Design a protein around this ligand. Structure first.
Ligand SMILES: COc1ccc2cc(-c3nc[nH]c3-c3ccncc3)ccc2c1
Length: 277
């Protein structure tokens, strides 16, 4: 009778294995450090979470085990996880380009369409893998999308938006097993608008009004539609579809002409400009 015996998270001092090079983001996206393995010299990013209950901790440890089980080139690898002195430390592969939203704030501008296309394609590849393996992400947003040194995307988890449920699907707002595959697809659509406009739809509202606004409004569209291609606008319509029967799956979206793209050059250019700023 096969059974999982233990989590991958260890009850050990992370400092026994990892050196902290420095804090990343100066608090702008949480308590995050650049770290380096003492024996192997491998680089990592370490996120430290102060858990508030046994139940919260267990939920995180379950989620970490899922991440550890993923094997896809566009999903970040888990390098280590520790629980030590009331803190959860989660270490992933270091992604020298950082998070997509942090890049936008650094450069004070959104991604160009050619950049969004690449991010969309690679993130959709990761999301499709998850869905095919019966996993839902539930927190898709630009703060969970990371750039490598070579201009590829890695999907992460537990990210914080760089500086409220903006990415939540309307049926999930209205019906509180609430999250499912279709809800992730909606969140992808919101993330695309986030990358096109820096902030997601309804960012200007009082946050208390946001769920109501999502429930009662038509799906959001791009604020300046003449700046974007018909393919991008159509791809968005397939994600941001209130009728759950008509909202496209990740397998359908993979065939959409918007994500027919062969080169990550636009992202290499983006991160070279961020790196030189
Ligand atoms: C799943 O555990 C983690 C651990 C570190 C994380 C760091 C980030 C992050 N946010 C801004 N920059 C980073 C980051 C991630 C990897 N390499 C450099 C910077 C996002 C999600 C993370 C999630």
């Amino acid at each position: 009778s096969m059974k999982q015996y233990e989590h991958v998270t260890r009850d050990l001092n992370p400092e026994d294995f990892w050196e902290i090079i420095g804090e990343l983001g100066d608090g702008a996206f949480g308590k995050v450090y650049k770290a380096q393995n003492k024996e192997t010299s491998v680089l990592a990013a370490a996120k430290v979470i102060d858990t508030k209950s046994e139940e919260e901790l267990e939920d995180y440890m379950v989620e970490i085990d899922i991440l550890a089980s993923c094997d896809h080139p566009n999903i970040v690898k888990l390098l280590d996880a520790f629980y030590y002195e009331n803190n959860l430390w989660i270490l992933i592969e270091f992604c020298a380009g950082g998070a997509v939203d942090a890049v936008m704030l650094e450069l004070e501008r959104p991604l160009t369409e050619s950049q969004i296309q690449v991010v969309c394609k690679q993130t959709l590849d990761a999301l499709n893998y998850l869905h095919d393996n019966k996993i839902i992400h539930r927190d898709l947003k630009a703060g969970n999308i990371l750039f490598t040194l070579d201009g590829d995307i890695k999907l992460a988890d537990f990210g914080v938006s760089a500086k409220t449920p903006y990415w939540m699907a309307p049926e999930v707002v209205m019906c509180e097993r609430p999250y499912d595959y279709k809800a992730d697809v909606w969140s992808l659509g919101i993330t695309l608008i986030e990358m096109a406009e820096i902030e997601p739809p309804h960012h200007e509202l009082n946050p208390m009004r946001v769920l109501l606004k999502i429930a009662k409004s038509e799906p959001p569209t791009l604020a300046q539609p003449s700046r974007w291609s018909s393919n991008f606008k159509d791809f968005l319509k397939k994600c941001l579809e209130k009728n759950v029967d008509a909202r496209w799956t990740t397998s359908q979206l993979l065939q959409h002409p918007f994500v027919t793209v062969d080169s990550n050059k636009p992202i290499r250019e983006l991160i070279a400009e961020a790196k030189a700023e």
